[PDB]
Amino acid sequence: QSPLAAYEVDDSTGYLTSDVGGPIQDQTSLKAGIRGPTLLEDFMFRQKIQHFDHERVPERAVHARGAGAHGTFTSYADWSNITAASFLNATGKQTPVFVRFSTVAGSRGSADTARDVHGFATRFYTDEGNFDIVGNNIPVFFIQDAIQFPDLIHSVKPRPDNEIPQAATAHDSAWDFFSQQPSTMHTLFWAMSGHGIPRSYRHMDGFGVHTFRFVKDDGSSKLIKWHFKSRQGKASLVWEEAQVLSGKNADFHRQDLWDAIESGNGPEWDVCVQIVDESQAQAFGFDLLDPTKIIPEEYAPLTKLGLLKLDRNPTNYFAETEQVMFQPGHIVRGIDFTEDPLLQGRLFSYLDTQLNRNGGPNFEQLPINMPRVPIHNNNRDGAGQMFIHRNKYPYTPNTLNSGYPRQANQNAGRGFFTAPGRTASGALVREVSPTFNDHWSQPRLFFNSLTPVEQQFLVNAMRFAISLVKSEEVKKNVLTQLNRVSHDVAVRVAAAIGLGAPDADDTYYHNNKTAGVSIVGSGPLPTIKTLRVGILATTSESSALDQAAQLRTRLEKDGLVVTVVAETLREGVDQTYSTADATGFDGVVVVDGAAALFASTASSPLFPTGRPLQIFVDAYRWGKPVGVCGGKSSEVLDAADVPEDGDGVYSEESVDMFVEEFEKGLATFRFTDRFALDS
Amino acid sequence: SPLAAYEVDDSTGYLTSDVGGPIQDQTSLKAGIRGPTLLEDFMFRQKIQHFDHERVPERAVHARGAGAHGTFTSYADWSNITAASFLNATGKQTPVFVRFSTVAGSRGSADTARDVHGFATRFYTDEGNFDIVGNNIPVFFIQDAIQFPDLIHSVKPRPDNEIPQAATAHDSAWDFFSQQPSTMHTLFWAMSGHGIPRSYRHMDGFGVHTFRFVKDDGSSKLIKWHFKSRQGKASLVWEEAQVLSGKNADFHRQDLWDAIESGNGPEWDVCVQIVDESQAQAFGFDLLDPTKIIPEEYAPLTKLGLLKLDRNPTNYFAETEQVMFQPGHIVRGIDFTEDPLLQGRLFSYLDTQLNRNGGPNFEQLPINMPRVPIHNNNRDGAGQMFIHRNKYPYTPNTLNSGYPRQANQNAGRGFFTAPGRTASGALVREVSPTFNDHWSQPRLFFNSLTPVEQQFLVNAMRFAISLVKSEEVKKNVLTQLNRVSHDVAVRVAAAIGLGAPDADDTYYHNNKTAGVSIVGSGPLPTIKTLRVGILATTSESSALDQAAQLRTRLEKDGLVVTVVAETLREGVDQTYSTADATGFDGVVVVDGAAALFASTASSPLFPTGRPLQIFVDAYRWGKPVGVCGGKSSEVLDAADVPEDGDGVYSEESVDMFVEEFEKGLATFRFTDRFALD
Amino acid sequence: ETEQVMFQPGHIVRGIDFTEDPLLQGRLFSYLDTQLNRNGGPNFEQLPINMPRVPIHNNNRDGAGQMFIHRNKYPYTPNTLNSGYPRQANQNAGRGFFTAPGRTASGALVREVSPTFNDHWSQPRLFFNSLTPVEQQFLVNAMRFAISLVKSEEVKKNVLTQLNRVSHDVAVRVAAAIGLGAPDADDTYYHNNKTAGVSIVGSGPLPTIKTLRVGILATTSESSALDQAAQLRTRLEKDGLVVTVVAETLREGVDQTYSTADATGFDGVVVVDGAAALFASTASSPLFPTGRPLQIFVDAYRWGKPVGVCGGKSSEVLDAADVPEDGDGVYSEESVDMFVEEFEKGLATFRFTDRFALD
Numbered sequence A: 001q002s003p004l005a006a007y008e009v010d011d012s013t014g015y016l017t018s019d020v021g022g023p024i025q026d027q028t029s030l031k032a033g034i035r036g037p038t039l040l041e042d043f044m045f046r047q048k049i050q051h052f053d054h055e056r057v058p059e060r061a062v063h064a065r066g067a068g069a070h071g072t073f074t075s076y077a078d079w080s081n082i083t084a085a086s087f088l089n090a091t092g093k094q095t096p097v098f099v100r101f102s103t104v105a106g107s108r109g110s111a112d113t114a115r116d117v118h119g120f121a122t123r124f125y126t127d128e129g130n131f132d133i134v135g136n137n138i139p140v141f142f143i144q145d146a147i148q149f150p151d152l153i154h155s156v157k158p159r160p161d162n163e164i165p166q167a168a169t170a171h172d173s174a175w176d177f178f179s180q181q182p183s184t185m186h187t188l189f190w191a192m193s194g195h196g197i198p199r200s201y202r203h204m205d206g207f208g209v210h211t212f213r214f215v216k217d218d219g220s221s222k223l224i225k226w227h228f229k230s231r232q233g234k235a236s237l238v239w240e241e242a243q244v245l246s247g248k249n250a251d252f253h254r255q256d257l258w259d260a261i262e263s264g265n266g267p268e269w270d271v272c273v274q275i276v277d278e279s280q281a282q283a284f285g286f287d288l289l290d291p292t293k294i295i296p297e298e299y300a301p302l303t304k305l306g307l308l309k310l311d312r313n314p315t316n317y318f319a320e321t322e323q324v325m326f327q328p329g330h331i332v333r334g335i336d337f338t339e340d341p342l343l344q345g346r347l348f349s350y351l352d353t354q355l356n357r358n359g360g361p362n363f364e365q366l367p368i369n370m371p372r373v374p375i376h377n378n379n380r381d382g383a384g385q386m387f388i389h390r391n392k393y394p395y396t397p398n399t400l401n402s403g404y405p406r407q408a409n410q411n412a413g414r415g416f417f418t419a420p421g422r423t424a425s426g427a428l429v430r431e432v433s434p435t436f437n438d439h440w441s442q443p444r445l446f447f448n449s450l451t452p453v454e455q456q457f458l459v460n461a462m463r464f465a466i467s468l469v470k471s472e473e474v475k476k477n478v479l480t481q482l483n484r485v486s487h488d489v490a491v492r493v494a495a496a497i498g499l500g501a502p503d504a505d506d507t508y509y510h511n512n513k514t515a516g517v518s519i520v521g522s523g524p525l526p527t528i529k530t531l532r533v534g535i536l537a538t539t540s541e542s543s544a545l546d547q548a549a550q551l552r553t554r555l556e557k558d559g560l561v562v563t564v565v566a567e568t569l570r571e572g573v574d575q576t577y578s579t580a581d582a583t584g585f586d587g588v589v590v591v592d593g594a595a596a597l598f599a600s601t602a603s604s605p606l607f608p609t610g611r612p613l614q615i616f617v618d619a620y621r622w623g624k625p626v627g628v629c630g631g632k633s634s635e636v637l638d639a640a641d642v643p644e645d646g647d648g649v650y651s652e653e654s655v656d657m658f659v660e661e662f663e664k665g666l667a668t669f670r671f672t673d674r675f676a677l678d679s
Numbered sequence B: 001s002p003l004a005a006y007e008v009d010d011s012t013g014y015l016t017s018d019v020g021g022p023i024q025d026q027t028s029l030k031a032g033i034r035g036p037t038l039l040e041d042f043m044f045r046q047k048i049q050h051f052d053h054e055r056v057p058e059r060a061v062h063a064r065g066a067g068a069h070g071t072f073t074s075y076a077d078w079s080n081i082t083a084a085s086f087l088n089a090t091g092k093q094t095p096v097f098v099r100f101s102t103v104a105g106s107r108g109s110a111d112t113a114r115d116v117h118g119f120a121t122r123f124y125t126d127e128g129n130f131d132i133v134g135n136n137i138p139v140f141f142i143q144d145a146i147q148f149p150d151l152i153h154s155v156k157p158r159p160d161n162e163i164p165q166a167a168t169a170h171d172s173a174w175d176f177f178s179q180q181p182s183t184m185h186t187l188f189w190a191m192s193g194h195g196i197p198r199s200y201r202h203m204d205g206f207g208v209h210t211f212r213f214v215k216d217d218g219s220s221k222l223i224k225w226h227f228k229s230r231q232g233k234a235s236l237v238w239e240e241a242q243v244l245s246g247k248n249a250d251f252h253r254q255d256l257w258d259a260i261e262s263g264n265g266p267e268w269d270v271c272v273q274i275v276d277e278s279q280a281q282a283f284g285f286d287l288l289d290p291t292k293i294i295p296e297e298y299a300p301l302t303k304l305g306l307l308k309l310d311r312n313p314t315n316y317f318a319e320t321e322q323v324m325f326q327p328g329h330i331v332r333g334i335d336f337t338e339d340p341l342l343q344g345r346l347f348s349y350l351d352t353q354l355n356r357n358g359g360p361n362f363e364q365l366p367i368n369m370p371r372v373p374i375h376n377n378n379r380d381g382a383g384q385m386f387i388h389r390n391k392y393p394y395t396p397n398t399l400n401s402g403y404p405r406q407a408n409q410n411a412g413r414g415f416f417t418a419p420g421r422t423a424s425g426a427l428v429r430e431v432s433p434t435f436n437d438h439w440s441q442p443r444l445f446f447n448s449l450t451p452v453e454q455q456f457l458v459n460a461m462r463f464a465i466s467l468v469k470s471e472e473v474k475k476n477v478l479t480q481l482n483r484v485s486h487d488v489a490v491r492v493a494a495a496i497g498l499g500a501p502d503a504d505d506t507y508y509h510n511n512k513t514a515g516v517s518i519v520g521s522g523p524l525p526t527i528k529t530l531r532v533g534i535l536a537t538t539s540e541s542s543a544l545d546q547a548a549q550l551r552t553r554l555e556k557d558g559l560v561v562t563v564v565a566e567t568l569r570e571g572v573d574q575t576y577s578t579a580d581a582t583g584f585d586g587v588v589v590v591d592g593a594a595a596l597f598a599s600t601a602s603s604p605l606f607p608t609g610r611p612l613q614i615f616v617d618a619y620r621w622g623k624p625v626g627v628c629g630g631k632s633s634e635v636l637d638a639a640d641v642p643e644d645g646d647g648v649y650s651e652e653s654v655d656m657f658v659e660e661f662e663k664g665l666a667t668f669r670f671t672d673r674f675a676l677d
Numbered sequence C: 001e002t003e004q005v006m007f008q009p010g011h012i013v014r015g016i017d018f019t020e021d022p023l024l025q026g027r028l029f030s031y032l033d034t035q036l037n038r039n040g041g042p043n044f045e046q047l048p049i050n051m052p053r054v055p056i057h058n059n060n061r062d063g064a065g066q067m068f069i070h071r072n073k074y075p076y077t078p079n080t081l082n083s084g085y086p087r088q089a090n091q092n093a094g095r096g097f098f099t100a101p102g103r104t105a106s107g108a109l110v111r112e113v114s115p116t117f118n119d120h121w122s123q124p125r126l127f128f129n130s131l132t133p134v135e136q137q138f139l140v141n142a143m144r145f146a147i148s149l150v151k152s153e154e155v156k157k158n159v160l161t162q163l164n165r166v167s168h169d170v171a172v173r174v175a176a177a178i179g180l181g182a183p184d185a186d187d188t189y190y191h192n193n194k195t196a197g198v199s200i201v202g203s204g205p206l207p208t209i210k211t212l213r214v215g216i217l218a219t220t221s222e223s224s225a226l227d228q229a230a231q232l233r234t235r236l237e238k239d240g241l242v243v244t245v246v247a248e249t250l251r252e253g254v255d256q257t258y259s260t261a262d263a264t265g266f267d268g269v270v271v272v273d274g275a276a277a278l279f280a281s282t283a284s285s286p287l288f289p290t291g292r293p294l295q296i297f298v299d300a301y302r303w304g305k306p307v308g309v310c311g312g313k314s315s316e317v318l319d320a321a322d323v324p325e326d327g328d329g330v331y332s333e334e335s336v337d338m339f340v341e342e343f344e345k346g347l348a349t350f351r352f353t354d355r356f357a358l359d
Ligand code: HEM
Pocket: A059, A060, A061, A062, A063, A066, A100, A101, A102, A118, A119, A120, A121, A134, A135, A136, A141, A145, A146, A147, A149, A208, A209, A210, A291, A324, A325, A326, A342, A345, A346, A349, A350, A353, A354, A357, B048, B052
């Protein structure tokens, strides 16, 4: 009775039919003789190849690369005291959800592990209509006015003469826009942090970005920010790992999410708001209409409203994930917009762009887009009309259908209503509020709030990206804008590109910090379930496979995903060295029984030269917990040049001691002492 | 410049709407300075509507690709074999556009996937557009076009989760291959170096199908198209291709774009095998079967002319994305064959452009327009650009004096079906038994590779099949491989912990054919455009001096030189942080930089061990590597590279270094560095 | 339902097959293709009106507006991973469609017309011979009307050349209206053969008069005219005729005003004699155009319809206001029962063809 159940098609049995139920074959063309030309009258051929010919639809203009899952939202309380929203109106109230995660710049097929902003779009199929929160993993946006979105996106997408390159943040046009449009600095700093390369969709947060309104039935309103706070904790890749992972497994994030749901480890978020009074719009030292600013948690704490859990994978990716069409216009009674000029223009874009993707106006009829309550309106006809409307008088006002459907409003049929306190006053202007003009304080706040090695990673990400800018003018302009946020950042970045930084300009410099934005500083992960352990073994020593089988039992107990790697497959071995890479693991364990594979002179026609040692060395250099289990453990760490007294290096004869130490390393997740800092 | 009439210049002027009204586009119109946005803001809505509607559907296959403009030059008057006007005079020039592609990946997927590749050529001929829509592999997976969706569904990502984008590395692909043995020949090509070509410039193009050449006298001959690279044939190694897919997803489009901008526009000899109609079933297989090659030993290549790509697009979307190729774009002098794969394609490419273009006037797009007049009674349709003067667009008419006139064999240089063509028999959905040998030609191909090449193909199969979860699919795969070669089945089986079935010698043989080996095609005929990375340091003025000296002598011979160091300055192209061995065809270390290669070396400016990793990766992937300056053993010992190794260079003299190294770049890969079973 | 219904000759079932009719052959392509235009996407068979009433089992997927959620994640043949489903249907399994096995093709691949198609004129002449004399006049008259609106003298000459090959008599009679000479007879394709079942005029009386439309022209002037109209309505509605009572103004038992009424609205027209006064020169009123009541009667008579006057007073510059009382399909009775019994025969005759002039 859910529109998805009714539309499920089972092909587990039966004879092949046309789309109109006529049994057919589809394996040989109809020909004038056994070596003859194909006949036009072969309808079986044409219906099949026409469908194939038309399978593709336009990719999303942005966030083209992504993956979705089904789940549930459960309210923690009756939130009537702050909003009329029905999905929040009772303790334990459950609403089905669909979520799609994404990058922003890359086309379909682009790697998940690009450095990019990420999408986090949540549909609540509420009992008063579909409500979408179309958010990002970063709480601030590049630009202050929706009319600028094509300029931003044209600048970060590939240069349009050759469609090169697919590196959003690593070409001239992107840094030209960033340096010419200083609003971009706050999101740029977030994108150059580990938030640009999250470990998974499950290990990042969701943000509505915009200030919205909570509207009560009495018509009063408060200003809110949405925060979806991950229960898996926060985690990043390191860049040099992200680049290899983009080649070895372009599907890493979609596969991570799919596997977590299949294993009963469906990811969870606390859905939260900051709530402040209308009178505080300009009280925090910036404008709450400005989507380049966060409200520091010290000024306004998070309230937990409910639990978001994703626990079911799609049946058909195309029908569900590709076709889901989100809109901030999908709003419900008890929520209202703000005069954020970015949000304001979004409302137009998402209704319009679905005409491009769907090719017709009836996109809300696709099962994934349908609501879970009756539809009563006078919308008619259009390509792909799937309803048969009984009301032959679809106009208001009518007597011939007894005045149905009835208007809904603040006082009728639980209508949506605009927050009745809202006003507008002044000239009809194309002018930016001077309250929006501080582009550099919050980037500085964010930078101050990261740990020293985290600041190094961000500087290194900028050194990497800006070094690939060919224009000396663009590079100069970039250092000018970076210098307004932090002289130190402009100096350290200028060092990698052989330019002089501008002289300190302390206009926007400050020492303030804010909790909750650091990944490095966010402490050990609250759970290690789903984390990936590579056990490097060998088929040559039956001791090595026993060591591996004993580590496997002890690690699988704690919900770790264990891969035993050997030269060849056999029972208890999951993967060959040939297909194995350190990007596939959160921690790597060598069984000392396999010590001979790590020799400088080790060679095999079954995997590339040096593969076993490369996995262990890559894992170590990328900051992961690594260890040798067995007794000649000290022996093998020398081959690797991996110091046995190293933080996050494990060397035990006992399996139980090895795992107990190693599992703490997985929770630590990254050993940041292995990364050099500027002097 | 061939599309110069459609070009729009925005180097000067004030922003306008699409209807030439000067406007702004940086701030929304609002009811007050902190007000909501007005619906009456047409500047906002026209700009965002355009943005909202930028995207068109990607191609159903070959979504990932890149294109360039060029010229075709005929070597001769080919009247004696074909009426084709573009081939009718020595030196006759015809503009071309080519698009290269992979097959399975979506439009943002890495260039260096393991896959079949497309090679589509449009000839804008003086008798209409002629398209050869070819691949870099001369045989196709399937014998009947009706099977194409089965093939493409099986190789594309699993439709519940759209995982994985590794076309040849999931259960569904190997399920199809093992149940549809026609796939074996193309599969063996895709598992060879032909699946990971070094560039578009270093692969051939093939029409795959037998076509006909038809003379003005109506007589016909059967032909195959072969576009033979003048750059020579080259592959990546898999271990390299995987890293390159992450470090530079754009590697093949950038290689082509750079080659054209540097005046190194790639060249192909456009060739044909020509055989008689009487030889359709004479070579031990059916020329209508697209899973079979004519061995060059049976029918030699005739060179018809030169294809040169020498001009990049102005707008990628308008030119490369919007180019709509069709095998139905045929000219007088060419005809089809009863190849059931070709027959169905003729339907598919006319139909699929309705999907991409969203309307029927896709031939009116600048890139799709012909360079000669259009005279027909096609009318109206969404996006009609033409304003037709003829108000009587019907035949037969008197009110337009019977224009346009019907063109045929005898009048108006009409296209005509080869008049010797017949059909005879039952109307059947039956496969010709002449198509039934799926395994001999796969064995021919395998037999025709060098021992190291054979190892690479076994290794590609071991990699891919080891990722198949189904034990029943892996067994069915070994049953099909075993019918091509027991040795291949045993070597693959060893990787996956299964027994190969007993030898089945029905199709086994020791025949070989020339021209299908990459390793066997000898040194490259040119090293121009090949990439030399010079690893230096800013910490030693003399390291930079060595690098500048090496640059001057390498650039003289047309090599693309990248000097790498810790930081950028005059004469340093890239930092260690952005550098990778996938970036170079050879790596040189200047001995002044030897300190960077110590196990102890550490910098906040690049990842731990990056300088030595570039050297070791380059060595391990078979590239020419060396140390210039005389002090070589610190670098070579840190790398575990032997000084006496083939393609390992150590010279004090820059001149002697470069002469040796340039020989290495021609050899291109040192195959003695790969282990054999 | 109606606008979105998407018909195809390629919608065929086991037990039916095509022929090599080159018109049919090309239709098979057109109707699958044209639905992409109308629907804007490839899933037009999923529209309710186009859906079948039996299960769909196939590997068609995706496309704009995809409504199905397919469970089968291995939509290729041949497969083992979905156990080889869906299975191939053919002559010997799963009730597959199959091409008629006796069908063959032989010869050159040709863009040539079969000479067996070349007689374009015998069958036109067969059709023309099979029409009644008045029916032949109607057809001549339709050609005179249409060809008289052609401006090109050359096209008009070419038309008489082709019509002449069917019938010299047709070419002569059409030529007379357009001021041209018919070309000399050409008897290559002339014949006197006839076939049953193609004539309308010759197909005899209608097998039922249910739904046929009777306009009763009355007046609000005379409560007796409204009483006549009411008794006529009761007696006509009993036999399933659709009755419209017409008067100057609406009220109980009046369906339409003279202002909206027209002879095209009726298969038969009855005037109640209580309304005789409206059928005179006098007949001016701000409630309908001058002459409207009589025009409905005169139009109905001129177009061959059964017409009459019920109540017994028929002459009263009523019929005399135009038409003959002895006319076939002209009725005059005082008795409502006798009037209706005569009138219903006239509705079954449907058209009185003796009212049209012949060449
Ligand atoms: C706070 C700023 C923004 C955020 C957080 C944001 C977030 C997103 C997300 C998550 C998606 C992908 C939804 C999915 O998975 O299907 C998306 C798609 C899109 N966004 Fe935004 N966006 C922002 C600003 C804008 C602006 C200013 C515009 C245009 C003026 C815009 C236009 C679009 C369009 C056209 C799409 C494709 C929508 C579709 O095809 O369904 N976005 N955005």
